[PDB]
Ligand binder design. Structure first.
Ligand SMILES: OC[C@H]1O[C@H](O)[C@@H](O)[C@@H](O)[C@@H]1O
Ligand SMILES: OC[C@H]1O[C@H](O)[C@@H](O)[C@@H](O)[C@@H]1O
Ligand SMILES: [Ca+2]
Ligand SMILES: [Ca+2]
Ligand SMILES: [Mn+2]
Ligand SMILES: [Mn+2]
Lengths: 49, 180, 180, 47
């Protein structure tokens, strides 16, 4: 059980739009590997204050 | 109050709530973004747009996502380019490949991209990656030069379990990866 | 195992996770399907496809939805045609208007349509509607002639709170409407 | 507080496709009213 953790401040409001799409990307170039996803879950919530 | 949620524990051959781009495809049980082939791009998006902030109230969403991914390189020491979870405009299409992970175009901050990404980078690109040459986790904001990174030792063929979360009150994005 | 969920407690002018058809549109606060005008149709759909059942397992989903709606007739005696919550194919487009509520095209069972709808019917159509000529709740499977109905006294201008639930083990669909 | 209830067996597996869209519709014909929804929530789960 090897665990890594990174954390920072991203002010979403100033970078992305109100409505977004989220997802995954993977690429190869001169070197390569297969990239695979097995499970995914997402939950978000926004207030109307 | 607006809520969006979903859970996919095992993928189906017809997985209609995802949008596929590049070579992205699903099968029984997993989503394959790229096969082990040179010069390729795979992207997979969730169908519905997500309301992540409101200009009228000024509010921002709290969100949490988690996924299990496998990287499988046939030459275990020559590995490239990586994988990212990203957040982008609704109309997002594949950007530059190779070291640009299909999500950016530049190693300079570009206000036009409107994309935040969390990368699991497996290949050292001298023009912008950590000088320590380690494979790494990183937080990218409109640039392929990450704002912050962490060295990570890849386990080939092993399941990484990742959780990413964003706190609306503090604006901190937390990333954790775990191998068994 | 697959879950889909969402919550919208107030509709916005830019409700981009919905798909509008006909005259359906969102305003500040409300989702408007029809204004009070003659021969009109309005539909609004959640953008993401839902996996309601599965081939390899034969598994079927359990789901529940809840909504508040308001019908507003300028003449409380000449009220037509009604409202439905429906489950239809991914490529669903509006069907016949007026008495067919925009989801069916006939009163004979039609396997093609592949739509189950829960109707809140305000207008008696002699050809298929209940003999008592009452406004009613109904469960519709591939026909505008409901498999079951219950008389409902329309409270004009009032908010109706609906809960529709489907239990997969029993295959029982339950509808409940409550006024304050 | 006034309420109405309805129940019936529906064999969803023999009527709708595996993947569906859900939504609302409302119509007027020779006669009419405004039809509006104020809120909406959904949850489904397949195993
Ligand atoms: O695959 C590794 C490497 O291959 C090439 O040198 C380029 O496409 C780079 O962008 C990529 O990072
Ligand atoms: O609007 C009430 C009524 O008007 C006409 O008679 C037709 O359009 C019907 O289908 C509809 O039900
Ligand atoms: Ca790199
Ligand atoms: Ca009718
Ligand atoms: Mn990097
Ligand atoms: Mn009827």
């Amino acid at each position: 059980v090897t665990s890594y953790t990174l954390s920072d401040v991203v002010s979403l409001k100033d970078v992305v739009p109100e409505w977004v799409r989220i997802g995954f990307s993977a690429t190869t170039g001169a070197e390569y590997a297969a990239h695979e996803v097995l499970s995914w879950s997402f939950h978000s919530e926004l207030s109307g204050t | 109050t607006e809520t969006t949620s979903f859970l996919i524990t095992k993928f189906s051959p017809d997985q209609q709530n995802l949008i596929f781009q590049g070579d992205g495809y699903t099968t029984k049980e997993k989503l394959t973004l790229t096969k082990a082939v040179k010069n390729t791009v795979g992207r997979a998006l969730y169908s519905s747009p997500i309301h992540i902030w409101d200009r009228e109230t000024g509010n921002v969403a709290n969100f949490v996502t988690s996924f299990t991914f496998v990287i499988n390189a046939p030459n275990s020491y020559n590995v490239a380019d990586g994988f990212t979870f990203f957040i982008a405009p609704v109309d997002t299409k594949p950007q530059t490949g190779g070291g640009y992970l299909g999500v950016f175009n530049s190693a300079e901050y570009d206000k036009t991209t409107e994309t935040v990404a969390v990368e699991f980078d497996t290949f050292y690109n001298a023009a912008w990656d950590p000088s320590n040459r380690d494979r790494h986790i990183g937080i990218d904001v409109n640039s392929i030069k990450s704002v912050n990174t962490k060295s990570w030792k890849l386990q080939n063929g092993e399941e990484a379990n990742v959780v990413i979360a964003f706190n609306a009150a503090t604006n901190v994005l937390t990333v954790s990866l775990t191998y068994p």
